[PDB]
Design a protein around this nucleic acid. Structure first.
Lengths: 44, 48, 149, 150, 48, 73, 357
RNA sequence: UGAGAAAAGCCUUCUCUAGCGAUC
């Protein structure tokens, strides 16, 4: 029940109450789904 | 006779299924902490 | 019936049942059973009922008449009472709320009845009844538990 | 929100205060009238609108007019008709015009408006109401028959 | 929205609709016949 | 209201003009002028959207009373 | 977390969150999303329509027209009035629920209950009365809905054992009811008090025997079953049951006396009883026999059971005169004798008859 | 990248459209 290496609750850098410039990173990993169609713009 | 026996067994099966979800019912309500009432008025017979 | 022999009256009825084969035979069969009890006795009605119990176009008045004749007889064989109601409930049990209610009161009010069967009849009534008839049976029984009937 | 409602209640204030001056209505009655008037006003200013709300508003105003009419005769005070009676009549006319604009297809609302105009309104208002009815509902000969009959 | 139909067309529709109700009426008679034979040959199965 | 004219008070013609449609033939007036039909309809329409339904007794498990927005989505 | 427990204990229905917001609304008939879009006038109309339907079935409901189903009841909100007004409202709602209990399966009763929940929040203020009203119908799904209206999440709550039927939406099983009845005595006292109170309420109206049928049947069914279920019936169960047994014996309603007779028979069957208690029980059974003339036979037969499963010399000499003075004792005894053994009653009554002669 | 990474349930803060409302 006891916890160790605890830290006080503070603001995170990924909060959207911060501005976009101030925000750290969206921290999103994108995976190309195999079922997903591949679309590209190729001028003729 | 065979038909009526199945409905007797089917009724019991439905009740047993309900009993499993509902519970045995043996448990009771749990006890609660008590805090004394404060600023209680009293009567002093010394004044008499 | 008024001014002819009883054998000719049965002859007329048998010709009628051959001619009419569809839904119009419903009224024909009902008057045939009523004549049998008047011209004959309980035994004559039994023979007529046995012959016509399989001609499928029916009405609930056919079975209510047969049960009524059983009640008037002194024997009142309670097993035959159930045997008629099961046949009636086989045909019209899916839609007739009143027939189920009448069955339940027979087990209660009849001196030879077994009211411990009322638990099963109510349970059976719920499943065969469909749609709006299911609601009406519940209200009628709850009306029956109170004295308003 | 209650900006328009507050405008309407402050418009309704002077005739209530005059009625208090008459002695016809007691102060608690004025408070109750203001409360129910605000409750009914909140109903017809919403973004989602129903015809039942307009009908309830009109019926409340008609009942209030009848109550005032009954009490005036018992008191014997016949002055200041314009301050109270006509103010209520214009408010009800505005409610009817808005309701008829929202629901043109309902003839029954039009006939209710006509009956109220006959009972409480000037004949020129009833003429305009009949003209508005015959403008959009010209395909019903019965409406022409009633208009000619009047 | 429909187009008007000729006299010869509407007669053909009635004849097709005539056959529909006659087949359905026979099917009910066939179903009642099945109930008669089933109750005669294997009555215990039919009840159950 | 539908037929109460002052020409009725001053009888000048044996008859009056008859509009075919009547108030009773219609639903009636929405308002009353002396000492509820739509409210009956709202009461009836609301009752038809009731969770207590036919076959409610037939149902083995009642649907849950309330669910979180996350679960519904 | 001590602050959390203190705040949770300090919570009251008067300070409910749903009182101050219309995001969620408790409704017996509608989904909360649909129920949050209904005005007070519509709910009042539904309640008045239900009461008008109920008036045709039973006239005695007319007395509820003024306090609970009028304009004053429409404008009334309990929070603003004092504790005396709330107590009077609780009394009136309890009386109305006692009157509603027989007809609860009918739709108009459900409409009236919907109006009461919408206006007075009896699911927060009158939990006990609503539970008493709905309890004999615990197998039906409408009982499940009425339970689902309540909030019984706390494990310390009185009705916490009813939590599964709220969470799973299934009717309560009779076995759970019987087990909690015999293990927990507060629930048994609740049932007995409910039966006595309802009987006393309905006693005033002549020709009101029928409405108390189902309830009494339920009272007949569980208690006997509870006595069957318990492994050992301790003296607490008999101590609790005895006052209600005496109240049943002193009554005049046939069904209530029949339930008392069944309870007495089952108690006599299961547990051996002290001679003084058997003597007193037989004295009360014999003394009040002739109040109801249609239930004489069963009572006498009941006495036989009480005199057959107990010690032979349990009964004394005091009840002998009242036993002999009942009308047509020997004819009834012979009628019983045609099918069942009547030996214990004669075995008791003859040695006193010789001495009396 | 480094309040390590991965998964389930409860609150809080906010974003979009689409009808609706303006007719007196």
């Amino acid at each position: 029940t006891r916890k160790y290496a605890t830290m006080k609750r503070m603001l995170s850098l990924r909060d959207q109450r911060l501005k976009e410039k101030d925000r750290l990173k969206p921290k999103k990993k994108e995976k190309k789904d195999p079922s997903a169609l591949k679309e590209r713009e190729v001028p003729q | 006779e065979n038909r009526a026996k199945l409905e007797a067994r089917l009724r019991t099966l439905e009740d047993r299924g309900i009993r499993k979800i509902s519970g045995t019912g043996k448990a009771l309500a749990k006890t609660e902490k008590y805090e004394h009432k404060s600023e209680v008025k009293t009567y002093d017979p010394s004044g008499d | 019936e008024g001014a002819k022999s009883q054998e000719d009256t049965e002859a007329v009825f048998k010709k009628a049942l051959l001619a009419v084969i569809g839904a119009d035979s419903v009224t024909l069969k009902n008057k045939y059973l009523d004549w049998a009890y008047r011209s004959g006795g309980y035994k004559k009605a039994r023979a007529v009922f046995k012959s016509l119990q399989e001609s499928r176009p029916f009405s609930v008045d056919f079975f209510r008449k047969m049960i009524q004749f059983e009640k008037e007889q002194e024997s009142c064989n309670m097993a035959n009472i159930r045997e008629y109601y099961e046949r009636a409930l086989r045909e019209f049990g899916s839609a007739d709320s009143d027939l189920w209610m009448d069955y339940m009161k027979e087990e209660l009010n009849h001196p030879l009845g077994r009211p411990e069967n009322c638990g099963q009849i109510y349970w059976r009534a719920m499943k065969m009844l469909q749609g709006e008839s299911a609601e009406a049976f519940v209200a009628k029984h709850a009306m029956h538990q109170t004295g308003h009937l | 929100m209650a900006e328009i409602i507050q405008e309407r209640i402050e418009d309704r204030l002077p005739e209530l205060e005059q009625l208090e001056r008459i002695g016809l209505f007691s102060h608690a009655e004025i408070k109750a009238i203001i409360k129910k008037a605000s409750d009914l006003e909140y109903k017809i200013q919403r973004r989602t609108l129903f015809k039942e709300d307009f009908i309830n508003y009109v019926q409340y105003e008609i009942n209030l007019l009848e109550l005032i009419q009954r009490r005036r005769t018992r008191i014997g005070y016949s002055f200041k008709k314009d301050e109270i009676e006509n103010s209520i009549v214009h408010r009800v006319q505005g409610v009817f015009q808005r309701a008829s604009a929202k629901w043109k297809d309902d003839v029954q609302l039009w006939l209710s408006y006509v009956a109220f105009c006959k009972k409480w309104a000037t004949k020129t208002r009833l003429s305009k109401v009949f003209s508005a009815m015959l403008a959009i509902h010209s395909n019903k000969p019965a409406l022409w028959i009633m208009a000619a009959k009047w | 929205m429909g187009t008007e139909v000729s006299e010869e067309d509407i007669c053909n529709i009635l004849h097709l609709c005539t056959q529909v109700i006659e087949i359905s009426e026979y099917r009910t008679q066939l179903y009642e016949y099945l109930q008669n034979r089933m109750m005669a040959i294997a009555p215990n199965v039919t009840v159950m | 209201f539908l037929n109460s004219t002052k020409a009725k008070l001053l009888k000048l013609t044996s008859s009056s003009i008859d509009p075919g449609l009547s108030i009773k033939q219609l639903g009636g007036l929405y308002i009353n002028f002396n000492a509820t039909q739509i409210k009956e309809k709202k009461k009836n329409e609301l009752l038809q959207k009731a969770v207590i339904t036919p076959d409610f007794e037939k149902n083995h498990c009642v649907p849950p009373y309330s669910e979180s927005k996350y679960q519904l989505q | 977390t001590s602050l959390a427990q203190q705040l949770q204990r300090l919570a009251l229905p008067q300070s409910d969150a749903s009182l101050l917001s219309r995001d969620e609304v408790a409704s017996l008939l509608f989904d909360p999303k649909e129920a949050a879009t209904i005005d007070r006038d519509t709910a009042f109309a539904i309640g008045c329509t239900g009461l008008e339907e109920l008036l045709g079935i039973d006239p005695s409901f007319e007395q509820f027209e003024a306090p609970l189903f009028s304009q004053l009841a429409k404008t009334l909100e309990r929070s603003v009035q004092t504790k005396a007004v709330n107590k009077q409202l609780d009394e009136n709602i309890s009386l109305f629920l006692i009157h509603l209990s027989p007809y609860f399966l009918l739709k108009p009763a459900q409409k009236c209950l919907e109006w009461l929940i919408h206006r007075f929040h009896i699911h927060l203020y009158n939990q006990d009365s609503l539970i008493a009203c709905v309890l004999p119908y615990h197998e039906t799904r409408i009982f499940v809905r009425v339970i689902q209206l309540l909030k019984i999440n706390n494990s310390k709550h009185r009705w916490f054992w009813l939590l599964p039927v709220k969470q799973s939406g299934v009717p309560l099983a009779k076995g759970t009811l019987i087990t909690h009845c015999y293990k927990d005595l507060g629930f048994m006292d609740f049932i007995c008090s409910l039966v006595t109170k309802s009987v006393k309420v309905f006693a005033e109206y002549p020709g009101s025997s029928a409405q108390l049928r189902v309830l009494l049947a339920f009272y007949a069914s569980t208690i006997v079953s509870a006595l069957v279920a318990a492994e050992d019936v301790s003296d607490n169960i008999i101590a609790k049951l005895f006052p209600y047994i005496q109240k049943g014996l002193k009554s005049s309603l046939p069904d209530y006396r029949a339930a008392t007779y069944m309870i007495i028979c089952q108690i006599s069957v299961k547990v051996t009883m002290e001679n003084t208690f058997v003597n007193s029980l037989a004295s009360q059974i014999i003394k009040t026999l002739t109040k109801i003339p249609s239930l004489i036979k069963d009572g006498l037969s009941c006495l036989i059971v009480l005199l057959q499963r107990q010690k032979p010399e349990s009964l004394g000499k005091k009840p002998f005169p009242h036993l002999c003075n009942v009308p047509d004792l020997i004819t009834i005894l012979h009628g019983i004798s045609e099918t069942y053994d009547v030996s214990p009653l004669l075995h008791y009554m003859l040695p006193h008859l010789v001495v009396s002669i």
